[PDB]
Paper text:
The recently identified bacterial Sir2 domain-containing protein, defense-associated sirtuin 2 (DSR2), recognizes the phage tail tube and depletes NAD+ to abort phage propagation, which is counteracted by the phage-encoded DSR anti-defense 1 (DSAD1), but their molecular mechanisms remain unclear. Monomeric, rather than oligomeric, tail tube proteins preferentially bind to CTDclosed and activate Sir2 for NAD+ hydrolysis.
To elucidate the molecular mechanism underlying DSAD1-mediated DSR2 inhibition, we first purified the DSR2–DSAD1 complex, which showed no NADase activity, and then determined a cryo-EM structure of the DSR2–DSAD1 complex at a 2.5-Å resolution, in which approximately 60% density was observed, facilitating the accurate tracing of DSAD1 and CTD domains. The overall architecture of the tetrameric DSR2–DSAD1 complex closely resembles that of the apo complex. Each DSAD1 binds to the CTDopen of protomers 2 and 4, with the binding pocket of DSAD1 located on the backside of where the tail tubes bind. In contrast to the preference for binding to CTDclosed of protomers 1 and 3, superimposing of the DSAD1-bound protomer with either protomer 1 containing CTDclosed, or protomer 2 containing CTDopen from the apo form of DSR2 reveals more pronounced conformational changes in CTDclosed of protomer 1 that are needed for DSAD1 binding compared the CTDopen in protomer 2. Taken together, these observations indicate that binding of DSAD1 to CTDopen in protomers 2 and 4 allosterically prevents the binding of the tube protein to CTDclosed in protomers 1 and 3, thus preventing the tube-mediated activation of DSR2.
Author numbering:
A (entry chain D): 336 to 463, 467 to 495, 501 to 565, 579 to 636, 644 to 897, 911 to 1005
B (entry chain F): 11 to 126
C (entry chain C): 15 to 74, 79 to 462, 468 to 629, 645 to 670
């Protein structure tokens, strides 16, 4: 405690009352003339001292601070996700016990926890400065904790996996029975406990309590943002460059989640506060992208998107982010295209894999890279984590910064054709947690091209017969992609005889234009309902207002459904029967069409004004704000 | 009613319950629920009007609604606690004045959309 | 084994108890004999005697013959021949038997052994334990670690030489002369620790020598060492009493289990495995025992006015989750559930009378503590849980005059001064607070530690205020205010210059460190860590709920934040800790309330303000903090 060593590298005299050695050392560093006054032994010691301080980013005192450059550089293959390189490093024969320690962290990082536990046990045997011995004891206990946690997780949960043999599980329990990590530091040689007092915190259960409590300042509404960020980088560099397995535990991942989020929200608050007074902050880099990808869950990113506006946050080192994104997408191909899936390495990596591509919306990607991410996401991502419904959203997010070109369109077309290929089986059915299916991908291509025709799908459509019904109705959701010959061939398999077939046709996109026949079919259903008076009725009303129907014989059935007459004739509609709940069910196009009608507008703007004042509903407020309905 | 959550972006209720319903064709379904998907930026056709797309699941499998889906609730069972909750569902069904009042889970596609 | 424990003799279970408590306390030492080494097929000394006999007379034993024939061989054949036979017999590799692993699994403070092999050494390296191995005179001074692996008879690390080891006669004769430091170290370890003899026969020479020295010690000045007897036959009753009076507490393996004559490994394991599995077991069976165990954990907390419920999981070593709503949940208690049994006695009045006369009043003291602290029952017995929030502190309620009068009264106990010092701090008389806290430290051990913490905290407050007043106080006030004289500043600087708050807990008697583990978190901001992590987690959860427009019918999500907020305020104020003035603690209170009001406003348009809520915002919010809420 003789000095403060600030995160920007400035030393401050704190508590020492003797000679100022740190001030004297920096004077020796700046000018070389006094350096020659030292003895030869002290000259080489100063060079070693000078190397340590420049490598650790401690440059000078506070009062000599000038143009400070605090750029985070983590020299660790594990942090960058260089999965191939660490495999090669593990494969090579290790020269020294320091290389073994790096190997065991890499084995732990690659899901080979049994091998790292054996390696850490080996290092402990051969290492009795004794600093690697202590660090291996910390890491072996940490990996034993990870193995025990993974065994419990796997027993609770898609298929039954047994990554660790029960012989290995029984062995590590007998080696780690009644093992105290708390007594580890105290039982070390007294020379170690003096020289390496700063390593004691690794034996504690929690070591980021100080960093988490200091995060409270980021919520102050009255630099510090640089202090929290540099403190975060300090924790990352120490835990990764020194190869400590605690960097993969829940406490550290949550701490990065808390510190990164609060830094983002604080910068968001500063921007809005600035605009309030100035009337028109956080700049992410490659390391921030990795930190969000590795440590944030998809829900945690979602809490970020709703609270703040990351689209206002500018992303730097996009080629390094792209290299990270092409580098990660390569590993998915290795994990699933081949039989190289490591079930333990699976659990940790897929969460980072999902988060990186979800966060890849905000980064500009080159075409060659974008092909690799898209092809790895579309084809090689297992359906258990990213199903058909969620995968399009990951794919569709990449279009925010990268407007879909031809090459990516081909890949999605490849995906669509492969989706048609799996439909030869009648049992096969797409399972989506988002209510979102293969039709949405084709809509995306038609959105970005408006003229793309799927040749291979046309071949599959033309080959179709009446037998394989699962293929027929699947491609009816892909009608715009088919050619005219394929369109004519497919339409022969369905009929529009009764009203129900019309609704099925309108839902699957079988027909998009109303010939006069369906109007009569539309008309016939309504007279039956009118006769039987003493779901669809509201649906028909919208189509008349949307100019989908020009039969003009719609007013005969005015008086049954309050939504029907509300759409057929807004001028004559009574708005005391109006319910504000409808506007919540209406999409972008319909609400905008109501806004420009010049009828119904002042009534609904009054109902929306009443609702927000009485209830303060954000959906009502945003519906009123965006379209002025 | 302790797991019961009201979403206000769509005036529906989230509840871990199943439904035993009969349509207008006397067909019976047992242990069925619904899921709603708020996707305001969906690439709509010329004839898409509803902001939410709903999938009905029975026996863990989704249904292809080829006919009219007008239906009445005959028995609603809360999954976590087997107490019959049908009276609450019908009471809630009348109030919200919206299609498919009680839904197993709502999926919000707005926050994940690139145009968000 | 669990069955074997059930009908274990009451004496053996008591013997198992004291061994286990010593192992937890870190003061267990194992005296390992040749029997454990023989289990690993190490060359027994009787075959060394046989070889020496063959090379002496040509044809192949009392107690002294084991010592005399090697001495005869050493005298007439020489040192080279004696060590030559030593090398070709003892230079072998042998695997460590599981008993070596089980000995280390007991976590012994030191390992004293008469074996000259390295079997314990390699066993220690395989396990990862670090022991400073001492087998010669110079190793005692050059020991690098507190933990000692004491080979009192030497070993062959220097070489397979007769001088390095105590093997023959004239090595046992001159043992005290050639090993004064090692013998002193062994006696010192035995005096200060609890000793378990394993691998030794009851008639072993070393056991008698140690028992001979033990009789010299005055009555009850030493702990009676523990002896693990692994002879195939059950110990005779008359022999047992003889050695118990000599000073040994004998654990007989042959009496514990039925075993074969030559199956020594099962005999050693049956006691080692019973010892190992008793580490987690609480020896908890009857209701009187259950109250006794819970009382031992809770009774030290009676010194404190209030205990945070989240802190109670540390008292019982993560056995349970103590929820802020007052519900107890099984977390890591694999043994008998004493908390369930405790509340079963609480709800059922008839079973309370079943308890003994002592355990009845101990339960009553536990009942008042658990009711005062807001611990009700388990989660599965939870009903309508509504607890009013109340803080019995004058500092919290702003009764400045009442606290001023309280200082004027004469103190009747040491807790009276401790409350007075906190009130002096809350009234800005930090000088009177510091020297008062200094007086409590002199006359004080719960109050001692808390006064030291508060004195350091008030010292930091004075130093910060002095720096402010010197640097900005002249400009802020228009006058250079001098509330503290340089004599006061110099004196508090001198005393607190070498004081470290981090080692204050570690620099305490082990009884304090185990009874008051929850107080260690007060040295730093670690006591706020769990609530800070929880607050950040629910804040994201709550804000996500409001963002999506969801409303939940039933329990409100911020009730965890609401209860944790008053858990810290009640703990810090009623215990009179100066942490209430922490800038970080103020931020924690400000963030918790701000989340509560935002959720209430979100729920209002779909919680109300009390006297306690008004004080929290008044004390812990800045003006810009309140303005932010009024905007939103």
């Amino acid at each position: 405690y003789d000095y403060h060593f600030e995160v920007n590298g400035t030393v401050v005299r704190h508590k020492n009352k003797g000679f100022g050695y740190m001030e004297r050392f920096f004077e020796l560093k700046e000018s070389c003339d006094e350096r020659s006054k030292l003895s030869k032994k002290q000259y080489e010691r100063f060079n070693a001292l000078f190397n340590f301080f420049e490598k650790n980013g401690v440059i000078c005192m506070a009062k000599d601070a000038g143009t400070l450059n605090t750029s985070i550089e983590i020299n660790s293959l594990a942090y960058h996700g260089k999965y191939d390189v660490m495999k090669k490093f593990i494969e090579e024969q290790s020269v020294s016990i320091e290389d073994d320690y790096k190997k065991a962290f890499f084995l732990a990082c690659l899901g080979r926890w049994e091998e790292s536990y054996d390696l850490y046990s080996n290092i402990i045997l051969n290492s009795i400065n004794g600093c690697v011995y202590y660090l291996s004891q910390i890491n072996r206990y940490r990996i034993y904790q990870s193995i025990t946690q993974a065994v419990t997780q796997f027993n609770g949960l898609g298929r039954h996996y047994k990554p660790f043999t029960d012989e290995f599980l029984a062995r590590i329990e007998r080696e780690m029975t009644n093992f105290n990590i708390d007594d580890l530091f105290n039982g070390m040689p007294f020379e170690f406990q003096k020289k390496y007092k700063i390593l004691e915190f690794l034996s504690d259960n929690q070591f980021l309590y100080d960093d988490t409590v200091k995060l409270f300042e980021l919520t102050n509404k009255v630099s510090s943002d640089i202090v929290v960020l540099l403190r975060l980088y300090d924790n990352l560099r120490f835990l990764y460059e020194n190869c400590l397995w605690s960097v993969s535990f829940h406490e550290f991942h949550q701490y990065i989640r808390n510190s990164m989020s609060l830094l983002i929200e604080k910068a968001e608050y500063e921007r809005t506060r600035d605009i309030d007074e100035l009337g028109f902050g956080f700049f992410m880099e490659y390391y921030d992208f990795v930190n969000i990808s590795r440590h944030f869950k998809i829900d945690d990113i979602k809490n970020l998107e709703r609270s703040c506006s990351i689209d206002k946050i500018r992303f730097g080192e996009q080629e390094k982010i792209e290299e990270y994104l092409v580098g990660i997408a390569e590993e998915i191909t290795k994990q699933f295209s081949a039989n190289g899936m490591n079930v333990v390495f699976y659990t940790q990596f897929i969460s980072e894999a999902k988060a990186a591509l979800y966060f890849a919306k905000y980064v500009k990607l080159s075409e060659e890279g974008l092909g690799k991410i898209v092809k790895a996401l579309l084809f090689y991502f297992p359906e258990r984590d990213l199903d058909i419904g969620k995968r399009y959203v990951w794919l569709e997010r990449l279009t925010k910064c990268n407007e879909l070109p031809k090459s990516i369109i081909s890949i999605i077309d490849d995906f669509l054709v492969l989706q048609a290929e799996k439909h030869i089986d009648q049992n096969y059915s797409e399972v989506s947690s988002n209510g979102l299916y293969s039709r949405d991908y084709g809509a995306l291509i038609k959105h970005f091209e408006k003229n793309f025709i799927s040749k291979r799908l046309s071949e599959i459509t033309l080959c179709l017969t009446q037998d394989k019904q699962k293929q027929i109705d699947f491609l009816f959701k892909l009608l715009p992609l088919l050619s005219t010959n394929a369109k004519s061939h497919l339409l022969s398999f369905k009929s529009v005889e009764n009203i129900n077939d019309l609704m099925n046709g309108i839902r699957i996109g079988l027909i998009d234009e109303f010939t006069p026949e369906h109007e009569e079919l539309i008309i016939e259903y309504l007279e039956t309902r009118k006769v039987n008076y003493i779901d669809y009725m509201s649906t028909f009303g919208i189509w008349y207002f949307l100019e989908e129907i020009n039969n003009s014989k719609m007013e005969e059935f005015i008086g049954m459904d309050d939504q029907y007459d509300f759409f057929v004739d807004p001028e004559n509609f009574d708005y005391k029967k109006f319910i504000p709940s409808w506007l919540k069910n209406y999409n972008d196009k319909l609400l905008g069409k109501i806004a420009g009608n010049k009828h119904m507008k002042h009534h609904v703007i009054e109902v929306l004004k009443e609702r927000v004042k009485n209830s303060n509903d954000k959906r009502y407020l945003e519906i009123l704000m965006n379209y002025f309905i | 009613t302790h797991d019961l959550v009201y979403h206000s972006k769509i005036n529906t209720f989230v509840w871990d319950v199943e439904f035993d319903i009969v349509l207008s064709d006397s067909k019976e379904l047992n242990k069925c629920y619904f899921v709603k998907c708020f996707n305001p930026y969906r690439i709509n056709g010329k004839c898409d009007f509803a902001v939410s797309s709903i999938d009905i699941f029975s026996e863990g499998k989704r249904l292809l609604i080829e006919n009219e889906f007008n239906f009445k609730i005959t028995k609603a069972v809360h999954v976590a606690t087997s107490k019959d909750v049908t009276e609450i569902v019908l009471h809630l069904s009348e109030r919200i004045s919206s299609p498919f009042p009680i839904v197993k889970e709502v999926v919000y596609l707005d926050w994940s959309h690139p145009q968000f | 084994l669990k069955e074997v424990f059930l009908m274990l003799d009451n004496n053996v279970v008591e013997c198992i108890k004291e061994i286990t408590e010593s192992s937890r306390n870190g003061k267990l030492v194992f005296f390992v004999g040749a029997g454990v080494s023989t289990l690993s097929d190490y060359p027994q000394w009787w075959r060394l005697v046989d070889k020496y006999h063959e090379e002496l007379y040509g044809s192949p034993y009392s107690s002294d013959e084991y010592l005399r024939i090697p001495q005869i061989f050493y005298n007439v054949k020489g040192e080279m021949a004696f060590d030559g036979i030593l090398k070709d017999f003892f230079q072998v590799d042998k695997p460590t038997n599981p008993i070596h692993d089980k000995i280390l699994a007991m976590n012994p403070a030191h390992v004293i052994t008469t074996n000259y092999d390295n079997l314990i050494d390699t066993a220690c390296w395989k396990r990862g334990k670090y022991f400073s191995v001492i087998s010669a005179e110079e190793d005692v001074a050059n020991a690098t670690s507190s933990r000692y692996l004491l080979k009192v008879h030497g070993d062959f690390r220097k070489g397979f030489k007769g001088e390095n080891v105590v093997l023959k006669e004239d090595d046992y004769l001159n043992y005290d002369q050639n090993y004064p430091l090692i013998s002193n170290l062994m006696k010192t370890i035995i005096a200060t620790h609890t000793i378990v003899f394993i691998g030794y026969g009851l008639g072993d020479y070393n056991i008698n020598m140690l028992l001979n020295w033990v009789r010299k010690l005055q009555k009850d000045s030493f702990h009676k060492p523990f002896f693990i007897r692994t002879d195939p036959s059950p110990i005779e009753n008359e022999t047992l009493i003889y050695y118990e009076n000599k000073g040994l507490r004998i654990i007989d393996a042959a009496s514990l289990i039925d075993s074969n004559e030559y199956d020594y490994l099962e005999r050693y394991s049956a006691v080692m495995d019973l010892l190992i599995e008793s580490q987690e077991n609480k020896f908890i069976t009857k209701d009187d025992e259950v109250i006794d165990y819970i009382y031992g954990k809770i009774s030290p907390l009676f010194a404190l006015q209030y205990i945070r419920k989240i802190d109670l999981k540390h008292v019982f070593e993560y056995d349970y989750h103590f929820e802020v709503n007052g519900t107890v949940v099984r977390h890591k208690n694999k043994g008998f559930g004493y908390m369930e049994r405790f509340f079963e006695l609480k709800e059922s009045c008839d079973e309370r009378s079943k308890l003994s006369k002592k355990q009845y009043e101990r339960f009553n003291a536990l009942f008042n503590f658990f009711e005062k602290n807001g611990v009700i029952c388990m989660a599965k017995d939870a009903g309508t849980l509504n607890t009013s929030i109340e803080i019995n502190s004058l500092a919290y309620h702003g009764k400045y005059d009442v606290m001023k009068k309280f200082i004027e009264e004469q103190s009747v106990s040491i807790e009276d001064d401790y409350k007075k010092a906190f009130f002096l701090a809350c009234l800005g008389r930090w000088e009177e607070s510091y020297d008062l806290y200094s007086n409590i430290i002199l006359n004080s051990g719960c109050v001692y530690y808390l006064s030291q913490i508060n004195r350091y905290r008030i010292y930091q407050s004075i130093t910060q205020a002095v720096t402010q007043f010197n640097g900005l106080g002249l400009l802020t006030f228009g006058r250079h205010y001098k509330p503290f004289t340089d004599e006061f500043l110099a004196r508090i600087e001198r005393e607190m210059t070498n004081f470290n708050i981090d080692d204050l807990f570690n620099g305490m008697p082990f009884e304090f460190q185990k009874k008051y583990k929850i107080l260690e978190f007060l040295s730093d901001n670690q006591f706020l860590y769990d609530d800070t992590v929880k607050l950040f987690e629910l804040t994201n959860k709550v804000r996500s709920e409001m963002s999506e427009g969801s409303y939940s019918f039933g329990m409100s999500s911020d009730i965890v934040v609401l209860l944790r907020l008053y858990d810290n305020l009640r703990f810090l104020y009623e215990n009179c800790l100066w942490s209430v003035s922490f800038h970080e603690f103020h931020q924690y209170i400000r963030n918790s309330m701000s989340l509560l009001i935002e959720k209430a406003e979100y729920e209002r348009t779909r919680f109300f303000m009390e006297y306690y809520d008004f004080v929290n915002i008044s004390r812990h919010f800045k003006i810009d903090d309140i303005k932010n809420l009024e905007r939103s």
